[PDB]
Structures are given as structure tokens and as C-alpha cells.
Swiss-Prot record, chains A, B, C, D:
GO terms for cellular component: I band; M band. Belongs to the class I fructose-bisphosphate aldolase family. Pfam families: Glycolytic. Asn-360 in form alpha is deaminated to Asp in form beta. In vertebrates, three forms of this ubiquitous glycolytic enzyme are found, aldolase A in muscle, aldolase B in liver and aldolase C in brain. Plays a key role in glycolysis and gluconeogenesis. In addition, may also function as scaffolding protein. Beta-D-fructose 1,6-bisphosphate binds at residues 42, 271-273, 300, 303. One of its GO terms (molecular function) is fructose-bisphosphate aldolase activity. The lineage of its organism: Eukaryota, Metazoa, Chordata, Craniata, Vertebrata. The gene is ALDOA. The record marks 363 as: Necessary for preference for fructose 1,6-bisphosphate over fructose 1-phosphate. This is Fructose-bisphosphate aldolase A. Changing residue 146 to A: Loss of activity. The modification N6-malonyllysine is found at residues 110, 311. InterPro entries: Aldolase_I_AS (IPR029768), Aldolase_TIM (IPR013785), FBA_I (IPR000741).
Amino acid sequence: PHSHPALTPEQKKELSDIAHRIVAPGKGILAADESTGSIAKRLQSIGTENTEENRRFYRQLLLTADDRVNPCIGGVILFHETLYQKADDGRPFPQVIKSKGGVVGIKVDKGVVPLAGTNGETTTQGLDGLSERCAQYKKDGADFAKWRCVLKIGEHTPSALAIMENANVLARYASICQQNGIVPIVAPEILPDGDHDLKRCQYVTEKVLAAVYKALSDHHIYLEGTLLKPNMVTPGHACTQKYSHEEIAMATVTALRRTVPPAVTGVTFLSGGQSEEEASINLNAINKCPLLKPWALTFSYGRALQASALKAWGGKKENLKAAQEEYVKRALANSLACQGKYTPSGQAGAAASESLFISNHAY
Amino acid sequence: PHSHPALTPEQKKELSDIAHRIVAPGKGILAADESTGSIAKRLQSIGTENTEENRRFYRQLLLTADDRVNPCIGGVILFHETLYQKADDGRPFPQVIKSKGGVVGIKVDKGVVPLAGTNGETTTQGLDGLSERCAQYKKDGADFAKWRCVLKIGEHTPSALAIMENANVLARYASICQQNGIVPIVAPEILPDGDHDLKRCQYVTEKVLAAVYKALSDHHIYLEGTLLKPNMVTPGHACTQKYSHEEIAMATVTALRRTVPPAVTGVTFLSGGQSEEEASINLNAINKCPLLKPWALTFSYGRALQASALKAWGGKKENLKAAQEEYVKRALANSLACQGKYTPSGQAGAAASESLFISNHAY
Amino acid sequence: PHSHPALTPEQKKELSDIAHRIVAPGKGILAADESTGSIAKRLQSIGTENTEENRRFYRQLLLTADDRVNPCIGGVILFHETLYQKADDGRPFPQVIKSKGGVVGIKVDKGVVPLAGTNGETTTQGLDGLSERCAQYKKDGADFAKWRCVLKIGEHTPSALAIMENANVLARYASICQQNGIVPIVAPEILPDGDHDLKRCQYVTEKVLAAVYKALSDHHIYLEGTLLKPNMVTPGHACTQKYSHEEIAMATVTALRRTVPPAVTGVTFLSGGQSEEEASINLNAINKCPLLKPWALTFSYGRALQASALKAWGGKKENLKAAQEEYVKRALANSLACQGKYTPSGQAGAAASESLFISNHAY
Amino acid sequence: PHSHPALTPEQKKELSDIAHRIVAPGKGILAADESTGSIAKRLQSIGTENTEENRRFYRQLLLTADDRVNPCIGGVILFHETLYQKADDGRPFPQVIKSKGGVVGIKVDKGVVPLAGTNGETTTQGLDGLSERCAQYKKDGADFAKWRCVLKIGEHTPSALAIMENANVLARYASICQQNGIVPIVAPEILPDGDHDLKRCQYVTEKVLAAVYKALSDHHIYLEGTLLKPNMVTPGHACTQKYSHEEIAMATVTALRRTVPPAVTGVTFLSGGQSEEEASINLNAINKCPLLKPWALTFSYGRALQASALKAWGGKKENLKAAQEEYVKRALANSLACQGKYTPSGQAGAAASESLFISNHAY
């Protein structure tokens, strides 16, 4: 085929600049774009209600930390509502993140819907009018975006149709984003559920990353103006055989090494149902693995960067300072891990009180 | 490759029923689903401004036609606004049609959107919420829907990307429609512009369809409960090469046979700017073709049915008899054509009616 | 693709004329292409000497079937060896086939080879220097040729790579043939092995059939000059449920209706371990299935038309006239079968055969 | 999809070992696999008869030089013929090559065959018997194989079919090599013929390479035990534009970086028709590209090493030492180039080269 410049060289420069500012060495992303119902679950768990004012409050907390976290966070992923929310001193949240030293992010997908004739599979929707939302959002104060899809490993899942769909739908969204100066973060989230061991996870991950990078090539997306946010190679949470961080490190680096091109600027690992300490330890391990790593390997933790701070606040407005402090600490730990310079804090077991959910309820 | 029934015998049986009723021998489709804008223009050229009760009376005129049209009409495709309009007595339009023996349909796409670095090509949107909307429409009166995808022929069009995407989006629309118990029509309209010859048009038509039914397969579409709305096979509007209606017939059926599996219940053609008489002549020829045709070949005419009828409107109820019979005659002509029973009927009348150039400043 | 003629109108016709003459009403193909090894399996199994002469005799035995067989046989496929073999009357085998009114065909494939990473599934080799061979074969008296690609239904098979590989390989073989003026017989044979039921067999047959034709489109294959040689949709040879001949028929017709374009001239069927009369019953049932099938449903049986003949023969040249009559008998039956006019006296038939699964000793 | 191993750790390791040995710092590949007809091109030129005698003596001349270039050549590819020839010492050529400290490789493909419906595009053959052959070659001393794929850019080429077909045939070739302990060097050769610009070539390159590795994924290939032999991104032979060596590099490295997985152990650039001098200059430049280059960039040159050495021969025995020192000369400078340590840019205007398409005679 032959030439048809989708983006101008000027636009290309913009995307590269931004995509590169986010994944700077030592920085990572804080994912605080949880939807209304989702976050409602968090407030219920402690003893707090889920009101507008409260939401505005909790957010303001993580967002008002001291400048220790400044060289640690390259970006934050906000929820639509939060975008137009003001601080106590009247400062708009988007601007307040700017003052710290990071870029504004915004979730844009409109939830997953089911696929007919598949063993409980889904694809994500939300393309209708996307470009308009992006032009407006760029104007309002956001620079990049996050779009998620959900795949699961099982007997004979994911399906050819599922990997096919999501990978093309992700490329589709990506194209739109760039035409509006928005760096797209592609998130091919695989479920850590099941009795599949580590081997099966690595196998599934590769074939996915292959499917996603081909779809993007066909779609003419500017790789340098993108980011990848995948799951680490890990067995099902119900799996029997335990593995070491070294094995978890090797497996993850290997799959990416065989599927992610060096044009890609960064791989931002999500939390993935892991506790705070595990997340950090795995991040450090991945950045220690003796293999050639051309792209920055950082994090994009949601609750993995919160947990403590959450129950620290506990609704009790007076518990503010202590909470914020806990979170700041978790930020430093990660800043160190993404650069292979972190060391464990404690080998006891203060991690997750709802870990494997199959035996006797959850929400 | 493990199957999963997206539909049960009961689900299937229903979709297969609605499809056979609309394409029943003699019956064709009335596509009067023009958007508020597109119809505003149609009205303005006869002293009628873009006002609701105008376009509500216009929709009523056609709908309130003498029972002679009952058989000619298998199905009527409506728009959101019209679907919720009542006739001058109290009964809503869905019921006016149902009492006449036709089946109700609804247009559900949300227009087109520019593509990822292509040659001015596009893809169609409208998947968000489609699911609930399909159920609300079912509850309200729609038993079938319409989605339109537009292709273009050129030195490098349609592109490989173009074909793939437009085919994937139609299949996703199709599935969701079938779950909600609504028959989905697939309309992959190629453009009749440019100086492309008949062979060019035919050949392009062949690639796109092959990929379409192949896309339908991958999503597990119940072929028997669907309708294909293709652009008839003809050269470009700028072509200087004359062709008989016979040649045009051949290119059409030949193209169909090679890509349309016999499971498909019916194929309804579009006009494409061609005069209503010619649309009827061509349609009649396609049906007189010696080649075996396993699927019904009828019509879905909008302009080719409203042209003259509207052209004979002056203001109120005066032409509310003159106009009706006009469209009635056209229904009676096309009903014969879908049966190879349309006597040539030499067009020995006044000029064709759409946008006729008597433009200076009259009287 | 703008439009690039890969075949001329002159070229096309020749293909379609040969393609049609083979599948005329009553006609069917005799697949006596039992290779040097595969024949030994059925020759030196019963002690009969495996030798070129004995092989030479056997063929001429079937090839001398009087004029009664003529109308029943459209074409005969031979092994490379038999092509260059003459008869006792000094005449070379091809000339005799032709004087009978049948077309001469030959197997061009070079056997299957396993794929690394699959669960026992294979692909086929044999394209090297095929054009050269096709020229020599046309030159030598051959008008058509066949190539087989075998697939298997299992726990997780067939795999996407299986479907993809065998399908794209068939399309290549076909385009080589068409250029040399050779009618190709695509043969996606799915083996009846495994404890899978009827519906399952239909499902995996549907996807395999959708893939094959999409590939041909991409390769610019002329469907009007080809023949499809598939297997019948039946349960595995280890199923617990018995089904009626009407079921296998309805399952077979519906599947083809959902995948094969009306442009395809004919479909030749495989025996697949069926009894001679069982294959006969089935072929007759498919021809009377109330669904509208647009193609010629005929046979391409080998063992099913040759079983009794070998046995009747006994290696004694003195049983000649008996052995032939066994073949002739079967040809007639299936001649009546390929057109739904074959009913055993009484007009009621046998359903099951083995039943070593549909009883008590299966649980 | 489902997990299915193809190679054991035993095989993987051995594969990586040979691969890394070849693409070692300072080492590159000598391509002396010139078929009888190809050899007859220049042997006739240097007044020497085309006989196995001098053909043997020529290849010998290349091997029997001084060990000053041993660190230079890591691999040598020959023709089937030379594999079983011997030197004046009495020992076989592969012995000579092994003792000299180099890996023996052989060409397995059987030329290019034309594809119908295309604008003069081909695809390679050879797969038949491949496995049996490679087994024979390895036992004989061969360790790596070569397969040439051809791709010409044009106003209508490469076509999807050309890119699809050719990529899968390479995946097939590799898989078989792996199962036989042979390291497959895949090479999608882009042709410099045409008037096209530098950007156009890069655009196509990126598309091709994306399709190549995608196919490698589905076929379950071990990329660590594979090598890539691509062309450098340059303008067409009839391009009226002038480009600087560094600019040529940039474009080439970007194409690779945008599509090639870190897993790929080495990238052996093909001569492509440049003068020995610039072949080294461009390769040299490519290594000075400040962008991250995670895979060895080296050479796979034939004429680019033998060119001057041929002139210094012309079928004479008195010039043994003569011709040799020219080869040693060529090899060394390229070892330095593969290290980015070859004399910088400057020598571009003392002699210039064939570029009549850039003078006033191109109008």
C-alpha cells in the first residue's frame, strides 16, 4: 500500500512528548478513575457513605499529598465526575495535578457488554461520539486516556472471536484519541482467576499482545504516542502451585520481549488483585530480570497504591494527615521498584483479607 | 472451537418468521426513514418548511393509503420521531401499519465517522445502548431494523482496512438485534459515483460481500433471520459507457450467487439516484434473469417511491388524494417487478422528479 | 483489486463445461485412486499378491464395465501409476474412460504432514512444481484433479491454525490447476472419529466451510469451475444417540445452505466408513430434504462402490464377470440416489448399523 | 486459545546457541549461495568457462584465505552442490569452514512461482520433503537455512495476497527447520526497482514485517532461534531525489523498531545492489543511529564482498593470493561497520556512483 499521512509531524511530536513525560524513570501512574457503583463498594467496606461531597473529599486527599510524591507520579487517571470537581480553596482538580508535576488522565470506555455464543465473554463499547468527548476533554484539561477490555482464561477461553474483537475495538478507539491529541493507553486486562498455572498465563498473554499489535499496525496507530497497560504473568488466584518472584519476573519479561515492539514507549502494570507489597515486589523483580528491556517498565496501580490510606481515613475527617502519609509511602516504594532499587519491608503477611473469593461470599 | 447456542429453537423460529413475512411474494419495503435534516430538504422544494406537523402529515399521507397498497407493502422502515406519532383519530402509526398487514421496522445507526488514515473513507457508529433500545423498540412496535455502511470505489478504494471494519461493525449490530428478537437488515451500500465501469462495480461488490458473510459467520449470526440490502450492480455515475438493463441484471445476480449463501431469506435492493421507472425496469430484469436465485429479490425504495408523490404536493388536503394514488401506482409497479411481471410500460410521460433544474427565478 | 482478470472468458467456459458434465443428473464420480500403498492395505491384507500386474488387472476390471455403468459415472480419479497403464486390448486406460463418456481425473497431492504445536492435526504437501505436472496431465488426457485436506473434531480441535492452513493451501492448489485448464476438487475431509454428537459435527463443519471459500475469494478462484468434496454431517463413530436418516440429511443440507455459494456447480460426497447401502440411503435422503438446495448432490465413493467387487473377485481371474456386476449394481443404486429416486423395495430402511454403543455395554 | 508446546528447552537452547554465535560482535554472514545459473552470470564475465571445476575452485578460493577474517565471518551459506565438494587438501568444504571457526548454512527453497490475478507478483516453493532434507543437511554439517521471499513495490503492489501468502510460507519453512535443529533465517526481500521515494519504501516495510511476525506467532515459532535478513530502507533505482547516508539509516532502524520483537536474535542485512563501499557505509551508519537497537545489525553480503575479488581472478592460477586479499579486505571493513567503527561519512564525492536519475537527464 502507499502513503496517506494520518497525523502531521507536528501532532506526532506532541504525542511522543506526552507519552514520554508520563513514563519517566521513577514515575508511575495512580489509577483513581473508579466508577460510582464501584467506589460505592469501597466506602461501604469501612463505614462511610457514598455521597458526592465525600467522593470529592476522598479524591482531594490522594490529590493533595505533599511534594514527596511529585517526582513519583507521572500521571493520574481521573473519572469524568472528578474532572470538573473543585478543591477546598476553589482550585480545579485538573489544574492541581498540573501544579504537582504530572499529566491529567481520564477513563473513557462505557463498560463491557456480553458477546453472543461465547462462554461468558465481553467486549467494550463507547465509540459513539468519542471524538467530540476527546476534543472537549483535551480542552478541559486531560492529556491521555484509558480504555479497558476483559479477557479470561479457562477451558477453551479466550475465544478467537474475543481476542479478535477487543484487539480491533482497542485499535479503533486509539485512532480516535490521537486525532484529538490524546495519548491512548491500551489495556488488555487478563483475569487472574482459575486453576491455570503460570505456563498457561504466559502462553495466553503472548498470543494476545500479538493480536493487539497487529490490529494497531493495520489501523495506522502511532506507537510512540501510545502506552501499554497489561497484567503481569501470574497463575490463577485459585492455582495450587506457588511460584517465586523470579519466575513471575522471567515469565512476564519474556512474553513482552516476544510481542512488544521497541517503538512502544512504556508498559504500565496494573494492580491485578495483588496486595500492595506483592505489587511492589513484583515490579522490582521485573526491573531486575537479566533480559534486554527496551521500554520503560512501570506501574499504574489503583487500589495497590491506596489500601492503607483508605481505611486510614475511615470517613473520620480527622484521620486525614495519617491517611495521606500512608499513600505517599506506597508511592515512594513503587518509584524505587520501577528502577530496580527497592527492598522488602516485611515478610509477615499483612496483605489481603478477601484474597481468594470462592469460599463464602464477597460483594 | 466449542459452540454455544446464542439462540434457542424458539428464538430462531421467531426471527425466521419476521423475515419471510416482509419478503413474501409481491411484498417490498418502504424506506421512509429520512432524518429530520434529510427530509427538511425534501420538503422545502415544495413550499413546505422543516416543521414537524408538516413531516408528520407527510408521513401520514403515505401511511393512510387506499388498501390497494396493502399487498405491495411487506414492511415499512420508520424513524424514532415517526414511530411515536399518532394518526388523525388516535391510533399510533405502528398500529396503522400493522392493521394494513405490513411489518414495522426502525433505523438504528448513528451516522458515519472518518477513519484511521484512509482515503476519505468511513465506518458507521451506533452500538452504545443499542441493546436496551432494541428491547424498547420491540415493546413499542419494531420487528426489524436497518444499519447502513457506505463504501467508495476509487484508485485505491475501498481499502483493506475499510472492508474489514465496516464488516465487523455490521456483524456486531446483527447479533445484538437477534438477541432482542429483532430481524437485522445488513446494508453495505457501495457508492455509484465516479467513472468506474460495470465490471469494476461488480468486482468490488464481490470482495465486500465475501468478507461480510464471513464476518457474520465469526460472530455466529442466524443467517435465516436477516436480510441483505445491497446496492444494485451498475457502473459509475460519471461513466460514459452505455449498458442495457440486461447487462446490469447479469452483473447483479452473478455477483450475488458467488457471495450470498442460500440461507439468506431475501435480498432487497436500493435505488441509488436512478429514476423510479428505471429502478423498476432494472428490478424487473434482475428477476427475469435465467440464473437460479435461491433468495427473494425485492425492493426497499425511498426516493423511488416518494419522488413524484411529494413532487405533487401543494399545501394541505387538496393533494392528499392526488399524491397518494401517485405513490400507490409506484407500489403496484414495483410489486410486479419483484415478480418479473412488470410490463415494460414505456415511460411516455413528463420528466423525472427529484431536483429538476428549472432554476433562474420563475414568473 | 480494481479488477485484474486472472482468467479469460475463453478459459472460464472450458472449466465450467468440464465441471458441469461430470455432475449431470445421475452421474457421479468413482474415486478409484487407491495408491500403491493404500491398495496393498486392501490387497495384501487378504493375502492377494501385491504387484503392478495384479494392480493393473484390478483397474481394468472396473474399467471394463459395460454401457450400463456409463450414465452413472461422470468421472474417474486415478493414481499417477494407472494414468500411464494400458489394457489387455492394448488401449491406454484414459482413452477407454473417455469412450465411456466419463472425464479422466487424477490425485495431485503428496500426502499429509503434521504441524508443530497442534494436537495431532496435519496439513498437506504437494505444490512443488505442480504447474509443470498439471500441464503434463492435461497433455496426457486429464481434465480434472483432486487434493485432500483432513481435519479432526476433538476436545479442542480443530484449531484456528488448522482451519487457516488447510484452507489457504486448498486455494493455492486450485489456482495452479485453473491456469493449466484443470478443474480442481477442494476436499476438506473432517474425520468421524471421536465421541462427539451430530450437532457438534455440524458446527465445526460450518466454520471449516466458511473459511475455505473466503480463502478462494482472496485467491481469485473461479467457483463456477470447481467441485466441493466434503463428508456428511453425522455423529462420531462412537456416539450414544441414534438419529434418523432424515436428521443427518436435514443437518447436512442446512449446513451447506449456510456456507457454500450458489455459484459452485456441484458437491461430491465421501463415504467415510459407511456401508455401501448406508451411503446409498443417505445420499437418497439428502436429495429429498424439503429444503431448496441449488447444487448437484452426487457421489465420489471409492470403497462404497468397490467393497463387494474385491471380495467377489478373490484374486481368481475366473470371477471377473461377477466382480464387475457388483460394481455396476452399486453405481446404479447411487445413480438413483444422487436424485432422490432410490427406495429399497418396501420403502422403509435400516437406521443403525454397529450399535456397540447404543445399548447396555456402553455405560 | 489453548497451550501447546512445540519445542523442548533442549531444542530452544541449542537453537539460541547457534544463532548468537553467528550474530556475535564483529561477525557477519557471507552469502556464497549462487546457483549454477547465477554463477554463470559473472564467471562468464571474467572470461572463465562455466564448469563445476572452476566453480569448485572459486568457492575454494574464498575459503582457503588467511585467518585474518575468522573473527569476521560467523556464517556462510552455500549451494547444495558446493556442500559436497572438497578442497585441494582432500577434506570437504564444510570441514574447511568449521575448522576455520564458522557456522555452515544452506539454501532450501526452490525458486519463485508467479501468482495469478496479481500484478506480476510471486511466492516461494520448497516445503515438500523439507523436513527429510534438513535432517540430511544437519547430519552433514549444515546448521542454518535460507529462504528468499520477493516483494515489489508498485502503484498497485504489494497486494494483500502477496503479503499474506508469502508470510505464511515463511512461517511454514521456519517451523520445519526448528523441528530439525536448524536455525531458519527468514528474509522478506523488498525490491529497490521503481521510482518511489524513501518514505514509500519504509511504509511498505513496516506493513510487510508486521504481517511476517504476526504469522510467526500463529505458527508457534521460537524467535530466539531465528534470524531476519531484510533490505535497508532506500529510495527506488529511478528516484530523482538524493538522500544522505544517516537519513537512510534512520528510516531503516525505525521500520525495524516499529515491528521487530526483541526476541529476534539478529538482523542480517542483504547487499541489495549497492557498491561494496557504500554497503559498508550504510550498515556503519545504521549502527550510529542514537535510537535503541536491541538486536544485532550485521551483514549478509554476496557481491558486496566478491565484487573486486572476481576481477582480480578472471580464471587464472597465478593470482591466488591476489583475489584473496580482496575478500579479506572486504570482510574486515564490514566487521568494523557492523560495530559502527568503520570510517565515518566523508568519502561520498571523490568517485560518486550510478545516479543518472538525479541529473538533468531525468526530465
